Design a protein around this ligand. Structure first.
Ligand code: I75
Ligand code: CU
Ligand code: CU
Ligand code: CU
Ligand code: CU
Ligand code: CU
Ligand code: CU
Ligand code: CU
Ligand code: CU
Ligand code: CU
Ligand code: CU
Ligand code: CU
Ligand code: CU
Lengths: 278, 277, 279
């Protein structure tokens, strides 16, 4: 039937979050010890939500959690200079807040928190978290505005230096859907390089939600997007819409990059489970 | 005045050929021996369907892949979908197109209109690195009913360190007359980020490159950063507010402009003269 | 906080003088007075419809020019060697910039006005694209405002020029001071060989003409992070410490090696008492 939408926020929410080492000199965040992933756990909030994070550093080196776009005080900045990092074996409670749009007393329109954001390390290896980000400490954050369209499933694609989600070249990741599913994509970039993100057989609107608000929204519609370290955006597509089922490539479009394996599949299935030509 | 795009929905057909050009270059053409870089401009109205009859006249596999438009996986134009074209081979690629409208879930489905492009995916690699470098790319415009039509359209492709695969400092230059409504399609390919910059003129960063009205918040710019496979276009009024002259456009990356990615938008007085040129 | 002051309507004929000087260490800069040159050059603000007459003197050993983005100039003000609009050593020229309001064209289309965040810089030094002039520091912000645009308390220009910020030594800032609640404006220009991503802690803006959402209608992405290449310019305004509070709020390019090597600054937001918590 009609699209599902986000409820109003304003709830006070809590999660546990850990930083721990993974194989091969890699680091990630997790919701439980021994559960860490690259990228980290996806965090979703409704505008007005407050989130307290009970943070434990499991590692033998100082780490931090610094987030984009959300409201936080200087004590949640997650930086060395702000004394907000977390020592080895230590814990701290990071607090993220969130607000709805509205008229300022000066008569202007204050932008809400809503959008496609991310969190990552500001501390490991240098005071910009170069080592940490390189090792995999980063994760997506979605803040939704009341009435925002909710998807069937959400997937995070991170271009971190020459890799996707710190995976070895040519290893995807791949995401599955069924023709007609509403699929949300969160795209984040980290590290040294510019990239262009590209998706076969689909397009989105270049704007807050990734979708057009209606017939008056001028935003350019695009299948290809240039992005750079700490950039984040998102969007939703209806799997296979107008195109049909198939194995649909997404890849960085910088030629040496795609040539070198920054490539994935959006695997879109016929209602019966089959994918044509594959 | 201001002629506008009519409603789409027509079924259209063209023949398209891949062929070798001089110097190791390759290009698409509308007839054998007529291939160009960039390839032929393809224009469609929302709702239109285009059947492309493709012949690959080269001695290596080639393919046709498009951005933004509606194609089935069998028109993806990749080795992976088995949609490339063997040497001397022929295939029909089909591109469909749709107007915007309200989906069943009550969301607003975006139409196909916009500035897009097509290029090879199979030459030299499965990402068409070789083909793209050799020159297999071309502009596609899809127009929404009511879109403002230009007097002329020019395509500027920054391909690696070249414009339209031309030698340094060779242009292209485009001519117009003050007051002409001129459309530019701006495509980027290859290995490098760039910044497109046009003297004397400006456009809106949005679908049409023009402000829809007084309510459109889109930033107005003369400079745009663009990555490989990036696609955008706009229209300006030649010399509007600025008069006639040789109006430079180039990549604004300093070394690149010094290397010769530079061209002229030649805007003439009514008498055909250009002051300072 | 009271109702914000706004830009009035333009149409005035304005005049300034601009000098091109050599500064310490092979640097070059514009100035409003001989001996007053700065990098970035002086801030130039116009209301849509205004006309600006720049009386330009070149005091350097080599030819220089003045070339501006986004505004209305005849070919003779282009500021290039090819248009014969550059300036010989010890020479002068009047450069003229014009600006127009938006409006309905005779053809039914809507003509965009001049308003926005723009910049000017040398086109002639070291190469015909002014690669030298720019590396040496010749560049400066231009702001064109639309009637009714919201005015800030203070304006700050952050230029990423190759690997510097405003041509400064690494890890030198600049830092900017505000008090919690100030409406603060940033103009952000990029120059040189390299792409960048501009990032500001604890604040966000709208990616659009004014950097602020016009109202609930506005679909524009809200961002704390923006990619920019050479000659890109954009601006925005924030309420200092809004919903966040006092602190020393980092801004920096987020390309990792760039921030590591020092393109970093502080937006220092004081409390009313003038203290900054934990700094
Ligand atoms: C068109 O001439 C050239 C272009 C390139 C590019 C575009 O990288 C490299 C070497 C050349 O001789
Ligand atoms: Cu930072
Ligand atoms: Cu890439
Ligand atoms: Cu594609
Ligand atoms: Cu960050
Ligand atoms: Cu592809
Ligand atoms: Cu370039
Ligand atoms: Cu210019
Ligand atoms: Cu492509
Ligand atoms: Cu120029
Ligand atoms: Cu940088
Ligand atoms: Cu931040
Ligand atoms: Cu410039």
């Amino acid at each position: 039937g009609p699209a599902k939408t986000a409820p109003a926020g304003g709830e006070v929410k809590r999660i546990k979050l850990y930083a721990e080492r993974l194989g091969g000199g890699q680091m990630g965040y997790g919701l439980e010890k021994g559960k860490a992933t690259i990228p980290g756990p996806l965090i979703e909030l409704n505008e007005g939500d407050t989130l307290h994070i009970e943070f434990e550093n499991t590692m033998d080196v100082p780490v931090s959690l610094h987030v984009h776009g959300l409201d936080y005080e200087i004590s949640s900045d997650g930086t060395k200079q702000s004394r907000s990092d977390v020592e080895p074996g230590g814990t701290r409670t990071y607090t993220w807040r969130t607000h709805v749009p509205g008229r300022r007393a000066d008569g202007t329109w204050r932008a809400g928190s809503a959008g496609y954001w991310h969190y990552h390390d500001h501390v490991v290896g240098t005071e910009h978290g170069t080592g940490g980000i390189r090792n995999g400490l980063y994760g997506p954050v979605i803040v939704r505005r009341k009435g925002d369209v909710l998807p069937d499933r959400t997937h995070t694609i991170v271009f971190n230096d020459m890799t996707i989600n710190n995976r070895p070249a040519h290893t995807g990741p791949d995401f599955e859907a069924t023709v007609g599913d509403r699929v949300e994509f969160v795209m984040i970039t980290h590290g040294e390089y510019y990239h262009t993100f590209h998706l076969h057989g689909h397009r989105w609107a270049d704007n807050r939600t990734g979708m057009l608000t209606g017939p008056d929204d001028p935003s350019q519609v695009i299948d290809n997007k240039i992005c750079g370290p700490a950039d984040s955006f998102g969007f939703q597509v209806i799997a296979g819409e107008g195109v049909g089922a198939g194995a649909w490539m997404y890849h960085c479009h910088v030629q040496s990059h795609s040539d070198m394996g920054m490539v994935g599949l959006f695997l879109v299935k016929k209602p019966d489970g089959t994918i044509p030509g594959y």
